[PDB]
Amino acid sequence: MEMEKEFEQIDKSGSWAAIYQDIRHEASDFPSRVAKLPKNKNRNRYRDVSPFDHSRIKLHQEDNDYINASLIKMEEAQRSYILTQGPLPNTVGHFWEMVWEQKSRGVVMLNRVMEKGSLKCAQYWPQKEEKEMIFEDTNLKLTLISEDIKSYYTVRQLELENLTTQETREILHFHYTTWPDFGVPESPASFLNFLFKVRESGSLSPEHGPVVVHCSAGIGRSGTFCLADTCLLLMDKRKDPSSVDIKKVLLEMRKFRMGLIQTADQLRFSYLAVIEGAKFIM
Ligand SMILES: CNc1ncccn1
Numbered sequence: 001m002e003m004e005k006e007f008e009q010i011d012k013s014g015s016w017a018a019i020y021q022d023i024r025h026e027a028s029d030f031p032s033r034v035a036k037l038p039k040n041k042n043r044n045r046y047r048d049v050s051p052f053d054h055s056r057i058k059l060h061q062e063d064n065d066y067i068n069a070s071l072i073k074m075e076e077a078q079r080s081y082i083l084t085q086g087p088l089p090n091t092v093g094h095f096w097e098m099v100w101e102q103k104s105r106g107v108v109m110l111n112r113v114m115e116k117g118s119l120k121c122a123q124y125w126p127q128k129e130e131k132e133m134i135f136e137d138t139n140l141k142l143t144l145i146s147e148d149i150k151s152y153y154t155v156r157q158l159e160l161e162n163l164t165t166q167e168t169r170e171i172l173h174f175h176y177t178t179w180p181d182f183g184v185p186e187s188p189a190s191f192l193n194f195l196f197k198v199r200e201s202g203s204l205s206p207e208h209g210p211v212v213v214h215c216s217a218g219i220g221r222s223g224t225f226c227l228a229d230t231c232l233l234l235m236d237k238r239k240d241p242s243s244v245d246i247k248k249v250l251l252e253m254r255k256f257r258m259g260l261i262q263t264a265d266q267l268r269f270s271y272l273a274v275i276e277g278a279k280f281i282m
Contacts, residue, residue, distance in 0.1 A: 007271050016265075018270050027258070030052040030053070032050035034066055039064065045086065049217045056069065070256055071256065077237070080210040081210055085121075086111060086121025100169070104212050105170075105203045106203025109227060121216060129143070129144050139162070139164050152193070153174065157249040158172075175224060176191070178190065219258070221266075223259075231274045232277050246274060
């Protein structure tokens with residue numbers, strides 16, 4: 001079926017939970033043996049969210065190459081994304097090592113450091129120009145260059161230096177700051193505006209390594225971001241935009257990381273975002 005009218009048909013019939021459970025039943029199951037090794041317990045935020053072995057990002061280290069991060073490679077859309085958990089106190093250096101080694105231009109952050117009164121990720125970037133951060137375990141230096149605070153999101157320019165070679169690179173930090181503590185946003189308008197700002201920066205384009213996107217677990221809000229981007233791109237590429245099937249695209253993405261889209265409300269919100277976004281594109 002088309003999307004907008006499949007949408008109204010699920011609303012009128014109140015069957016979002018049943019649609020979402022079908023997705024959960026059909027989703028791929030692949031091994032995640034490296035994630036579950038005992039030496040990696042303090043590298044995982046949640047025991048039930050792990051990268052598959054076949055698609056995990058490897059650190060360029062011989063001691064321990066493990067990080068909770070996955071490469072989502074979308075062949076028809078010609079887009080790639082790295083989806084990862086919010087960094088932990090003992091993985092902030094690994095996180096920036098990955099950004100460096102994978103040649104990413106941008107980092108997309110969809111959560112606040114504290115939500116619901118609890119810490120959802122480490123304070124992994126500097127808040128003042130004159131107070132830079134050094135990660136001694138991976139030999140990197142990170143400096144805040146500029147910051148632009150808007151009503152729904154903040155953009156930061158950061159400098160990442162590989163202290164071993166003295167090479168430097170400019171990284172863009174795109175921080176969506178207004179996702180509610182409970183539920184999903186009422187309108188997709190600010191989320192779409194944010195996606196378009198990431199696109200306009202070049203961070204999603206083939207001349208760079210994959211964008212790094214995270215929330216707390218790296219599967220819920222993060223899944224919504226890449227699912228909406230890929231669906232909208234396919235609607236631009238194909239002769240028949242109504243052929244784009246958001247449930248099929250989501251199942252394709254779940255071949256590369258488990259659990260993408262965590263609730264039926266996130267699924268409904270993804271439909272809403274793609275539907276509204278397709279009208280603005282034209
Ligand atoms: C489908 N995306 C795309 N196509 C051509 C060039 C770049 N991106």
